[PDB]
Design a protein around this ligand. Structure first.
Ligand code: NAG
Ligand code: NAG
Ligand code: NAG
Ligand code: NAG
Ligand code: NAG
Ligand code: NAG
Ligand code: NAG
Ligand code: NAG
Ligand code: MG
Ligand code: MG
Ligand code: MG
Ligand code: MG
Ligand code: MG
Ligand code: MG
Ligand code: MG
Ligand code: ZN
Ligand code: ZN
Ligand code: ZN
Ligand code: ZN
Lengths: 439, 430, 441, 443
């Protein structure tokens, strides 16, 4: 009744137990369909049995092959497919059949069986938010029904479901598969069945292990970058980042038309970029306060503070107003008028090209910035020479207002200040930076 | 509902297999297709070189493993559809509908005719290995039948097809249903119809004649391999695949009078039985032409009394003759000097008490003639006896398609020679 | 019990298999024994009716499952010992001794001679599927061999034997080592001897004659089925199993210009090459006696310049001739009026299509030499149907070995070839490419 | 209904004329199907007309898209596709239909029309050899029938043919398309039709051109490495290399079970590896001749010299024999007995792990090597006390010149005999190129 193709994707060419894996399934059924998938032909040779029911699917482009040759669904003729990791072995007979039976009888589109390795699979919850570039894992509230798995498992599903995914075999599969299935609201049922481990497991030496863990980590980082996951969180608070830092370029490059590239991709500001802007805003405020420079939250930064005490989630910089006469109080600002200045913490201060303002960048390589706009009073009206004006009484006095994790100084009556600069109801009506292009 | 298309019946010199395959790929580009052949077809089929289309070469090769010639290893799906050359897929989901009918019905095979010039028809089929015979007729319970004649897509479970002894032996239309009918399986001839190829194969008369010739040769080789010596039809037509006047007989030299077919748990090959009947008829004609008194003897008289024919596991014919009449017939006179091959190719020899007439020089199915003489009211030979009144007179008795001569009161005669109740209690081989 | 005795080489009408089986059961009543046959042997073998002795009938049958004709179905031990008829177990423990030898050495097979009149000899064997040739010779590293000649018990793992395509194809002594030698497997001939049967089979001249006639027929059918067209011993004593003067050529009609053997990932059959060499030598001899100027052309000239023979994946021979010399040859004059079969069976024909002449090996075998007549016009040899070349390449002609005789070639033939084919053609063969042929067609 | 889909793949996000291109085709037929294909959403925005017959095809995996979304055939519903490069514009009406008419009536799978830029397309010959990892370009002998094009052209072919290729839209299309079509034996016919250039051409400054060329050359280098093209040549020269060199590891790395990785790929030795082997062989021979070491071609090197004067194209090292008595003549060899020596030109000389031979590697990183096998006479026989079959000494008295790998080396006298003794009768005449099927069976 049930035909199941075994599909092997997670293995290392320098050190693997794929021959044992495939032979253990052949011992239960000599005609068992098996597909080993690889990006390039493994060397040293896998030396799989060269029989028609065992096939190697190379997922690489080639001058002498058709398109179908790198599409793994054309190697799978059966209704069901079972993803089997290296290090597993078939020992008990008919396990795939019991998995098929459980899937037909259940409600999850995926069923799974742990492998009795030193790291068997465990049930996990998972939320994916592409707009915020974040994947949030947690403990499974309704185990053994999960959104994702952590560790080694045989995962069985219908071929039509697996190969309608965008990247069915992207490595690591343990990360890539459940990111895609959870996003679609699919569940994986963790069954009470266990596959045995290989008798001679792969990666038996500490050096061979260490080599494999580093290659895997490199593949996971590349995968998350390819798919737009900048941040992974775990319950307990553990964070791992996959985007910006002080030592790299910022994520999105130069902005045209006030609308950064990620907005056209229906995503908001990457969380790593937002983290850096908050750190730069916190730092610059500390420097100005220690130097005796009067400053106040400006533009979108003040708007975000008034709404929810933080940067607007699709914004990409921070604006502060300062008193023009106070500029000479700050060492970095005095230096900036002479040229670019890299200070005690690696931040870069410059007097800008465009319009008589200062710009503080997170680092020499990461150009996320705070802009400082000098104003001087003319007759109770704050103004500048290169370009709106506003009454000085909004700055007399300033008021405290949470922003980006700290307390910042804002104009008093900032609701009216914001409506004077943006229009009535701006606090209550969020918009994109300019809606004629994108709303 | 995954079904592998499997193509076995085509000719390399003239086929429509590329169109057949392309037509199924137009409905599903990932459709599993297996084209099976004994050797690599030339001119090249030039099938699409995609993973879901595969050529399975069934003959042994020095550079291949055992699995490479085993077809179940090319088929991963639950169901398999045998598709003949000349068919094409036009509407979608026809294999799906065949799968539904199979699961809904009670026949292990379902079939959909192909709209060729010879779309499949239902047939009844009765297979007797003991008698080396397959009997075909009209199907009483159509559209449920034992076998098909003509073009059809046939769908069954892969586990059923590939546990057969010769699942892809050619011609499939003969070999498959011989095996399924023997197992008591039925094929349901569904009401769906597959279209014919838009450019059919064998368009010329020469090509069709060539293909019919090769096909007849394959069917003959297949039936001889599988132990079918006779195919008979309702209405009387006979098809012979055994020995004849110019060949050896099917079983050769006998040892311990137990011919080889008995150890195979079979009876006498029907072609051998036919040759014995013709030799019996011929010899009787010669004997009666020359005025030689003969009567049925031994197992021949027993079979005549029982069912008017040779006992179906027997392998010769015995006749008694009056020793005093031997000189009346030329062949017997010659047989005393040496072997005589007469005008009709029969071989008469003396060799021994008796005379032996063989069907031909190559085919050694024979009639033995046993001369007796009346000594004092008892018939006797010189190397068991019986009273002469059993021959005074002789009586007509049908045997082997003609009217033979038998001793009078022959049921009593037979119980003399074999024991009481021999006619009613045949000694069946075991 | 780790070894199953398997008997495949015997004749139904005259064998010593009952003594063979008995001799092994006398040493161990539980010894697994399998007698393999295509059909039920007659007269009856009458083997002991015990669970460890089985007769395996390998032919498909209307009333049997697929497994009944698969020999691995009948073996449940790690090893198989192939034992020929005429052997007998006398000393106990011989099979266990072969297993120990096998495990401790590097050969996949180990063998023990049987003490018959034809005890097994160690042989070298190279199998070339591309050239359809099996080359035997004396074994340089005896007692490590590629093949055996004569009677021996051969032990190997059941997993190795039954993974082969034709594990029990007859004669086993031929088919087994063709398959194992191709895989690079060695057989080690041990210092162990099995005794001969006390009543040997085939003890009369007539019985031996019947057996050898049947054996020869099975061997010929086996080599044709497996694509071995030529068997040689030390490069000589050639045995042919392909086409000849009275048959069609092996590959038949070519479409369009890719013969069948290239799709089979092989080269030209050596019997076809042999017929081409004979035809080229005959035609050249005819042209020379008649006084027809000729020279090697095209791939024939390329082959001669490369290695003095036909390019081994090519399938014909090309010669250029002087058009004005055509009249000096009876066969060529006859060919312009119609097809001519000359006194030695060669068929000379004039191509109405391409304006050349064609000489075929025989009426049935269409391996051919093509003759291309050129005529000079202002010092350039040219033709009226289709590359032309300067006449000085033919003034004079030079000798050049080709296909076992000395042929005529243009002078400066290296330059000549480079002009026709391109620079470096002689040093860079266009080797057949199965992968590419699969792609292009 | 239209029968051609315009497909735009070659353009740069930072500076393109794709909006003008799309508009020019829509002006001839507002229903004209147009696909713009890209690996990521182009930024700045292309702002293409939001109509059903204009579509952006993003060829990238994404967590929220089905498999079909990244497959370009999904976006084409017509029989034909016209690949149009940025910088082109549709002015004359009906040019695509004339191309369809040309393709149907001719015998080329592809037809093309130059674009009137500063780099209009030219007709080229192209031979692709996967076994030799080489793409050989040249002037087209049968123009306007070509194997490949260089420069800007609109190329038309059946969608069924384009999207059946392994890498139909791999960049640069001008390189990857014709590598795939020429390998298949398909021809492209350059038609006598011309597309106009855009009124505002892209990449109009030297700086913009510089940025575009740097990226395009990076895409090309990555493309050829992924496809196994190690060498590009023009008219047999102007060599362009994409393999290993003195500063890298060799292509096939560590060899396991006497079978290098290129054999399992069903190819021969990479041409960069062969180039480095010839250079190392010439260098080592030059060193031995200057130092007064007697040497001769040995084994498969001698076989290759005798057969065609070069390394056997699927071999991966070089073997020479030397008189052991002469070893002390060479400084590098005398140092090699103490330990590894990196000489003045980066070559690494070592005395073997076990086996009593010397090894000279191309560099510290690149381990392509020449092996030197020392022999010594024991009364007429050459022998090494470690085991390269022993042979009579008269084959070395005298030595003979033999072309090998671009220079003249020394070989044993009567080398045909010599070779047949070591390899067997007829070895020179019977080369056996690798059999990947046999390899797939034997391992
Ligand atoms: C059978 O032979 C093939 C070679 O064609 C090999 O790949 C496979 O591993 C072998 N299987 C066994 C069980 O030895
Ligand atoms: C996932 O989202 C659901 C829906 O709001 C929420 O109840 C749950 O706490 C989230 N879990 C994690 C681990 O983010
Ligand atoms: C995608 O799913 C459909 C049915 O929803 C199925 O017919 C098709 O084969 C699937 N595609 C792949 C590539 O698996
Ligand atoms: C696709 O390309 C392969 C060659 O690799 C060929 O066999 C197949 O027929 C092609 N299919 C189409 C539709 O062109
Ligand atoms: C098969 O046997 C049945 C009785 O079991 C008989 O009625 C039928 O006629 C036989 N088949 C044929 C084709 O005669
Ligand atoms: C025979 O049938 C059994 C049970 O259905 C199955 O396990 C086996 O695979 C079949 N044999 C084949 C398909 O060759
Ligand atoms: C077999 O091939 C080897 C080369 O690999 C050769 O030395 C030997 O002479 C050959 N033997 C025969 C009998 O051809
Ligand atoms: C391509 O190959 C052909 C035939 O081998 C040859 O004539 C031609 O010169 C080659 N062209 C190039 C550019 O190498
Ligand atoms: Mg802002
Ligand atoms: Mg700003
Ligand atoms: Mg046709
Ligand atoms: Mg009798
Ligand atoms: Mg020719
Ligand atoms: Mg060498
Ligand atoms: Mg070496
Ligand atoms: Zn960032
Ligand atoms: Zn008969
Ligand atoms: Zn031949
Ligand atoms: Zn290299």
């Amino acid at each position: 009744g049930p035909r199941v193709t075994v599909l092997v994707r997670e293995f290392e060419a320098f050190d693997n137990a794929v021959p044992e894996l495939v032979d253990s399934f052949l011992q239960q059924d000599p005609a068992q369909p098996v597909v080993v998938a690889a990006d390039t032909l493994p060397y040293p040779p896998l030396a799989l049995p060269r029989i028609p029911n065992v096939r190697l699917a190379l997922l690489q482009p080639a001058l002498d092959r058709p398109a179908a040759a790198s599409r793994p669904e054309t190697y799978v003729a059966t209704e069901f497919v079972a993803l089997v990791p290296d290090g597993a072995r078939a020992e008990a007979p008919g396990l795939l059949e019991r998995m098929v039976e459980a899937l037909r009888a259940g409600s999850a589109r995926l069923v799974a069986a742990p492998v009795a390795t030193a790291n068997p699979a465990r049930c996990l919850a998972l939320n994916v938010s592409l707009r915020e570039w974040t994947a949030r894992y947690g403990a499974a509230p309704a185990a053994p029904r999960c959104d994702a798995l952590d560790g080694d498992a045989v995962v069985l599903l219908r071929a039509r479901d697996l190969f309608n995914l965008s990247a069915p075999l992207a490595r690591p599969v343990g990360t890539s598969l459940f990111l895609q299935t959870a996003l679609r609201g699919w569940a994986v049922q963790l069954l009470d069945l266990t596959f045995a481990a290989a008798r001679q497991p792969p990666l038996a030496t500490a050096h061979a292990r260490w080599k494999a863990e580093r290659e895997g980590r490199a593949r996971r980082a590349a995968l998350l970058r390819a798919l737009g996951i900048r941040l992974v969180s775990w319950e307990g608070g553990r964070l791992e980042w996959f985007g910006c830092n002080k030592e790299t370029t910022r994520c999105f490059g130069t902005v045209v038309g006030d609308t950064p590239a990620y907005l056209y991709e229906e995503r908001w500001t990457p969380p790593c970029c937002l983290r850096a802007l908050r750190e730069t805003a916190r730092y610059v405020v500390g420097v100005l306060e220690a130097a005796g420079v009067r400053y106040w939250l400006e533009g979108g930064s003040l708007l975000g503070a008034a709404r929810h005490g933080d940067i607007i989630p699709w914004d990409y910089d921070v604006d502060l107003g300062i008193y023009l006469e106070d500029v000479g109080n700050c060492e970095q600002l005095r230096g900036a008028e002479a040229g670019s200045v890299v200070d005690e913490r690696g931040f870069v201060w410059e007097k800008a090209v465009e319009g008589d303002f200062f710009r503080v960048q997170y680092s020499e390589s990461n150009h996320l910035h705070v802009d400082l706009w000098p104003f001087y009073p003319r007759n109770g009206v704050m103004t500048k020479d290169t370009w709106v004006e506003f009454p000085e009484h909004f700055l007399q006095p300033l008021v405290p207002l949470p922003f980006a994790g700290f307390v910042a100084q804002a104009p008093n009556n900032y609701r009216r200040f914001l409506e004077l600069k943006f229009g009535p109801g701006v606090i209550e009506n969020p918009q994109y930076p300019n809606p004629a292009l994108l709303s």
